[PDB]
Amino acid sequence: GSSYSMEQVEGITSENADMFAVAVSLVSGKILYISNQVASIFSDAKFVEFLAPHDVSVFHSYTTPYKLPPWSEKSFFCRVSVGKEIRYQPFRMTPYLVKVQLCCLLLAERVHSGYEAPRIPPEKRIFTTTHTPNCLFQAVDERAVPLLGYLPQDLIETPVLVQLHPSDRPLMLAIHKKILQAGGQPFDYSPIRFRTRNGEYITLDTSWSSFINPWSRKISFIIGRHKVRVGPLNEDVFAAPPCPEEKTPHPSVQELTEQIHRLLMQPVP
Amino acid sequence: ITSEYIVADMFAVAVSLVSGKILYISNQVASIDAKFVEFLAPHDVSVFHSYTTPYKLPMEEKSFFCRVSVGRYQPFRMTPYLVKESQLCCLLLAERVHSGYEAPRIPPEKRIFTTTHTPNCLFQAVDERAVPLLGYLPQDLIETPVLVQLHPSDRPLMLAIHKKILQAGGQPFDYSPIRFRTRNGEYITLDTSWSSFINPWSRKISFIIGRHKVRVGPLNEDVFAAPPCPEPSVQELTEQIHRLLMQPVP
């Protein structure tokens, strides 16, 4: 029972040159309050209009009322652009429910490729991935965005094998065999090459594990903890690839995929 | 060409992955070419699209559900198959879903379903068996607050259950009755077995899994029917259970 609004929405973080705050009407979608420095790192309309069209559905999902925590991790990513081809910049955002009418304030921080000053120490370039037996990503942890160039939503529900170098795909078959064989005990395997947003591959040192349904004994998820031992040749992992986007065919990928899923259908006694 | 290969009460269709409805077959349900999604319920069109995007279409039969129109809407379990130098289609096997408490009622001991949710207490999944027994399709519960679904009375018991879940380190345990709201608005009573999936490196819980047995169904056997009633403490409570789960083990 408290409405900040007006200037009470103040709480500068600068004193980051890459952050900004914004309050958005939960009913209108209109930008009620917008923090300064925005034009710097680059209005008054619907905030979604400045987001990549693919990230709009994402923004609404994570800003849904029955979610979010009242102002006194639950953060998502969005590419923002002050119009223009158009130029976007990835932003990590944390949503907070706040009254002005109850809206939603968000702290947005510009994200930087972990391969460029300030470069993420190699011993800490660690991210994890989770996937279902059908081999489609289920989640990618936040540490992955800076090391891959993709935002979580770009990889969720897509073939795991597609991101792997074509010569490291058949390896996945043996990796899963050991995974259900290991019955949950993590094990190392390297190197595996994983494709980033800019079409460049990074070399990973991976530890594999699985979550086993105790009642059915069937594997529910495959979890990997990755350490990028060799980053890409081009440090800006968010740039675009000079290749005609992705595709659909995936001749061998489909084959290898169903082959693995079949394998993971067996109970792990 | 092969129409209705794998097979009563259930029909089939083949849809162009570029346009609409090519093949359709034997109708049967007592009640009476274009885009297939036109017949689907609005809120399921996205579901149908998602489960039929080419890079997902290929046993256990990893299907999905959605309501098709009549005249009225009925729940259907559909299994998508990618049938291919000419036309690339998606062969869909359909099958009317019957209330678990209806004529073909599921035997007591078999009225079992499971649920999974993330530390933030929002459903990440609900298995196939949950539909016939609860009236909801997975898409209705996914990403929604698990607490909102429990009887307002049983809600507090959820803070205790999670604490034990934390203390259990993965060891499953049975819990007294908890009341779960079904689609038609009625509460069913459950005998629940709880467990968790612990990330092996950070030792934090990634998913809470529950296996439920329905020991008391609803008075109105038709669980898919609409609820005879309109559609903060839950928000706050959720924040407690959420905070609590940030603790490692061990």
Residue numbers in the entry:
A (entry chain A): 168 to 182, 187 to 213, 221 to 250, 265 to 276, 281 to 296, 305 to 473
B (entry chain B): 179 to 185, 188 to 212, 222 to 247, 263 to 275, 283 to 295, 303 to 449, 455 to 473
Lines quoted from the article behind this entry:
To provide insights into the PAS domain interactions of PERIOD proteins in the mammalian circadian clock, we have determined the crystal structure of the mouse PERIOD2 fragment mPER2, which includes the two PAS domains (PAS-A and PAS-B), the αE helix, and a short extension N-terminal to the PAS-A domain. The mPER2 structure was solved by molecular replacement using the refined dPER structure as search model. The structure revealed a noncrystallographic dimer, which, in contrast to dPER, is mainly stabilized by interactions between the PAS-B β-sheet surfaces that pack against each other in an antiparallel orientation. Interestingly, the PAS-B dimer interface includes the conserved Trp419 (corresponding to Trp482 of dPER) of both monomers as a crucial interface residue. In the homodimer, both Trp419 residues are 80% buried because of stacking interactions with the preceding Pro418 as well as van der Waals interactions with Ile427, Arg429, Pro390, and Ser413 of the dimerising molecule. Overall, the PAS-B dimer interface is predominantly hydrophobic and also includes two centrally located phenylalanines, Phe415 and Phe425, which establish stacking interactions to their noncrystallographic symmetry mates. In addition to the PAS-B β-sheet interactions, the mPER2 homodimer is stabilized by interactions of the PAS-A domain with helix αE and the PAS-B domain. In molecule 1, the PAS-A β-sheet surface is covered by an intramolecular interaction with residues 170–182 located N-terminal to the PAS-A domain. Notably, the αE helix of mPER2 contains a nuclear export signal (NES) comprising residues Leu460, Ile464, Leu467, and Met469. In contrast, the single mutations of Trp419, Ile427, or Phe415 in the PAS-B dimer interface of mPER2 to Glu disrupted mPER2 homodimers under gel filtration conditions.
